[PDB]
Design a protein around this ligand. Structure first.
Ligand SMILES: *[C@@H]1O[C@H](CO)[C@@H](O[C@@H]2O[C@H](CO)[C@@H](O[C@@H]3O[C@H](CO)[C@@H](O)[C@H](O[C@H]4O[C@H](CO)[C@@H](O)[C@H](O)[C@@H]4O)[C@@H]3O)[C@H](O)[C@H]2NC(C)=O)[C@H](O)[C@H]1NC(C)=O
Ligand SMILES: *[C@@H]1O[C@H](CO)[C@@H](O)[C@H](O)[C@H]1NC(C)=O
Lengths: 47, 36
């Protein structure tokens, strides 16, 4: 499912959790925050 | 055909996307289809 372009959610704002098309990865703002706040290791993409 | 998991040999890469049949890694899946 994909949210409609219009966001008339009775005044509720879900911008910070819905996908952000600007970024290449379609993660939302909070998802990006979490990913940056976790430091991973050994991605394994042919190092 | 190079993939994130590694080199895939003997299989043909197709633009089209279907349901995963045989997982490989990094979102790549292989399946037997049409000749065949
Ligand atoms: C629903 O979602 C959010 C909830 O608040 C809100 O929309 C945006 O919220 C952010 C708050 O972080 C606003 O960002 C700020 O806006 C001021 C005034 O315009 C600007 O100074 C900044 O925006 C700029 O930020 C960067 C430049 O510094 C660039 O990304 C760009 O140039 C921005 O213009 C500051 O960050 C933002 O203004 C609002 N925008 C809108 C359209 O609301 C609002 O409650 C609801 N927004 C939507 C789209 O539904
Ligand atoms: C798959 O996408 C690429 C990029 O457009 C394209 O060049 C290629 O032709 C496509 N695969 C086939 C078999 O057409």
């Amino acid at each position: 499912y994909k949210t409609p372009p219009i966001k008339d959610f009775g005044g509720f704002n879900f911008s910070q959790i819905l996908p952000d098309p600007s970024k290449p990865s379609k993660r939302s703002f909070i998802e990006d925050l979490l990913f940056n706040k976790v430091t991973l290791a050994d991605a394994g993409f042919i190092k | 055909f190079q993939t994130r998991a590694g080199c895939l040999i003997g299989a043909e890469h197709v633009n089209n996307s279907y349901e995963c049949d045989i997982p490989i890694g990094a979102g790549i899946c292989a399946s037997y289809q049409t000749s065949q």
